Nucleic acid binder design. Structure first.
Ligand code: BOG
Lengths: 274, 276
DNA sequence: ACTGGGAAGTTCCAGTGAT
DNA sequence: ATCACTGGAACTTCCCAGT
């Protein structure tokens, strides 16, 4: 067995799935170590083979059994919702720089699933009896299906390998959590300071403000009514563990989504004596 | 139009749905305000009509679209999973004393749904296409379908009205929270005292230990790994608001479920001064 | 049966940057 | 300059909860 290794996973959060109405292609999935400057792409290594062959990339469901997803991969060398291209004969490391995710509408689900079946796009060969019930339209995995050749030219299908899931950034409960701005980043160790926090879209029933430091955690105090049009929160700081401070102590403040335990990048908060 | 109002909702929690194999009544859904010395039952009022009429009561899903549920109502005047009988023509208020819920097995789900369709038990006329979503078999709603007569004296089906959800008491995500036994009920105002708490079944990813007083709240500290087989939690007390207590302070301690903000009954905990 | 209102799902659009 | 692409805004559907 030669086999396929993912050397660069896709970035999980931050990219929108795009509708067909928004255009032919849907951009390019970044690798998880992409940045403003040096941007990267999902990448695989084929161990134990070099030479001609085929790579197919398809979308499957986040959870097992990994059914073909109703959404589509679009971009260079994509057709019928999947990517397919000749493997580069020379190298054993392969990057995919033009993969976009095009989301199907909810009313077009049954048709999309019909197309997956008709195009033999079912990497795990899931029985049709299982392709009926609920799909998570906010998450997908890439499935890499590489075919290489034996010494006589016979195709050999390597075991399919799944990426980490990719989450729709436009969707209510799977978006990147991001603190955009706060009115202040320090306050008293007694707590009770009012913070106005501007954020990317949140759901008021599935959001908290989580303060953390060495062996300490607490929560900002607010009600659902204090979440203003999903993009601002007014809350009160918690008391720090120690209500009488020698000197300033720095802690982290982040948005937390309790449903999936996801966190924003931390913002520094400084607790002050008195 | 006359219309139906629910004046006594079914009690949401406390009933175990029974399987056919258990071969018993399946019991009687009590009303929301029922108490031992004052039994009450699910009750409706018809506004704008006294006179002959019939009612059908069926089970539908908790969430829209309100599809017929695979489970069955069983009891007097129930057949094919629904209740149907006359309403008293001399009165506007009607109660139902013997409604029970029989749960269908997962392997029998498709047969049960076929039965709902075959017996025209689809109160919201949901297309068969949309009856393909997964079902929550631990929650149902009652659906009351009253047929009256118009002023001319022909059959008139009123708009169906849904109850609050009824939950199977087997499901921990919707169960009553209960503290059964705790090994200590006081500790230092500095926090950090280890407590063993035995409780009714919880889910380890969706439980907290919540300490409160006037204008104060804090949580016990523990990981998922500290919840033992859904029925025990080993946690450390949070510090009290005031680390310089000069005498004991009583606070409340309770289990809390973050998902629906449900609380157990409170217990008394005393924080104590710490000398050493 | 309607009635006020928040937000999920879908579409449109203004600016625009790094090969 | 282009022009797919980015992220903000607008449009359309759904749903809850009250008289
Ligand atoms: C003087 C008020 C008379 C009643 C107002 C018009 C008829 C009732 O109007 C509405 O009908 C609904 C039924 O669909 C009820 O649930 C509401 O509570 C009621 O206000």
């Amino acid at each position: 067995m030669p086999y396929v290794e993912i050397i660069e996973q896709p970035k999980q959060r931050g990219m929108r799935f795009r509708y067909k109405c928004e255009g032919r292609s849907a951009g390019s999935i970044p690798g998880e170590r992409s940045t403003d400057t040096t941007k990267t792409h999902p990448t695989i290594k084929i161990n134990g083979y070099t030479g001609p062959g085929t790579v197919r990339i398809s979308l499957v469901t986040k959870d097992p059994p990994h059914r073909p997803h109703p959404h589509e991969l679009v971009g260079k060398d994509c057709r019928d919702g999947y990517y397919e291209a000749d493997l580069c004969p020379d190298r054993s490391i392969h990057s995919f720089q033009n993969l976009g995710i095009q989301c199907v509408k909810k009313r077009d689900l049954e048709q999309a699933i019909s197309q997956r079946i008709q195009t033999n796009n079912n990497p795990f060969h899931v029985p049709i009896e299982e392709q009926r019930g609920d799909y998570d339209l906010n998450a997908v995995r890439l499935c890499f299906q590489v075919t290489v050749r034996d010494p006589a030219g016979r195709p050999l299908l390597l075991t399919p390998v799944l990426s980490h899931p990719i989450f729709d950034n436009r969707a209510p409960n799977t978006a990147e959590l991001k603190i955009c701005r706060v009115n202040r980043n320090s306050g008293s160790c007694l707590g009770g300071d009012e913070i106005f926090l501007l954020c990317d879209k949140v759901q008021k029933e599935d959001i908290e403000v989580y303060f953390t430091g060495p062996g300490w955690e607490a929560r900002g105090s607010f009600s659902q009514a204090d979440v203003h049009r999903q993009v601002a929160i007014v809350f009160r700081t918690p008391p720090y563990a120690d209500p009488s401070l020698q000197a300033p102590v720095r802690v982290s403040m982040q948005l937390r989504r309790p449903s999936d335990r996801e966190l924003s990048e931390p913002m520094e908060f400084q607790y002050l004596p008195d």
